[PDB]
Amino acid sequence: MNPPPPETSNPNKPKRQTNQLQYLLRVVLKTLWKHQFAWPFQQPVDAVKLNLPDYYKIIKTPMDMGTIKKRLENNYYWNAQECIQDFNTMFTNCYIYNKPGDDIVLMAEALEKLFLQKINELPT
Ligand SMILES: C[C@@H]1C(=O)N(C)c2ccc(-c3ccc[nH]3)cc2N1C1CC1
C-alpha cells in the first residue's frame, strides 16, 4: 500500500553545494523541523499506518520534510530553487488531499507561512 519513498541519492544527478542550500538545511529546514506542527511532515505519509489506502491514489508526487532533509544532507540538489520546489510540493499535496479547515491543513498553512518568512531573504 506504500509506494517506495522519494529518492534521496542519485549518483548520476549533478550535485552542487551553494550557500543558499547550506542555509536551507541549517536555518530554514532545521527550524521548521522544531515547530510543534512539524511531526506529520517529518516522514513520508504512511498509508498503511494511517489506514488511508486512498492517499497515493490521489497524490502521485509525494514529498515530505524527512525526504528534503536527507536530500540536503546528501547534497542532492543543484540549487536552492530545486529544494524550494520540494517544499511547495509538500504543502500543495496537503492542500490537494485535504480540505480547507482540516487540522492537517492548518498545520501545513502555519508551516508554509513560517517557511515563506524564512526564505524571504537567503544568503548571497
Ligand atoms: C494524509 C494526510 C496528509 O496530507 N498528511 C501530510 C498527513 C501526515 C501525517 C499524518 C499522521 C497522523 C498520525 C500519524 N501520521 C496524517 C496526514 N493526513 C491527515 C488526515 C490526517
> Domains of the chain: which residue ranges?
18-122
36, burial (CB in 10 Å: exposed 0-12, middle 13-18, buried 19+) = exposed
Q: If one looks up domain 18-122 in CATH, what number appears?
A: 1.20.920.10
42, burial (CB in 10 Å: exposed 0-12, middle 13-18, buried 19+) = middle
Coil, strand or helix at 27 = helix
Experimental method: X-ray
- Distance (Å) of CA 14 to CA 10, 25, 85: 8, 19, 17
The C-alpha cell at 4 is: 517506495
Residue nearest to atom 15 of ligand 1 (CA): 40
Residue nearest to atom 16 of ligand 1 (CA): 40
> Residue 24: which residues within 8 A CB-CB, separation 6 or more?
72, 80, 83, 84, 119
Rg (CA), the chain: 14
The C-alpha cell at 95 is: 492542500
Contact residues of ligand 1, CB 6 A cut-off: 40-41, 45, 50, 52, 55, 94, 97-98, 104
**Residue 45 and residue 41: Cα distance in Å, rounded?**
8
Label residues 74-91 b or e (16+ Cβ within 10 Å = b). Answer: ebbbeebeebbebbebbb
- Distance (Å) of CA 4 to CA 63, 99, 111: 12, 26, 25
- The gap between the terminal CA atoms of the chain, to the nearest Å, is 43
Resolution of the model in angstroms: 2.2
**Residue 85 and residue 99: Cα distance in Å, rounded?**
22
Which runs of consecutive H residues, i.e. helices, occur in 1-124? 19-23, 30-32, 47-50, 55-58, 65-73, 80-97, 103-119
Return the DSSP state at 51: T
CA of 72 to the centre of ligand 1 (A): 23
Please count the other Cβ atoms lying within 10 Å of the Cβ belonging to residue 122. 16
CA of 114 to the centre of ligand 1 (A): 19
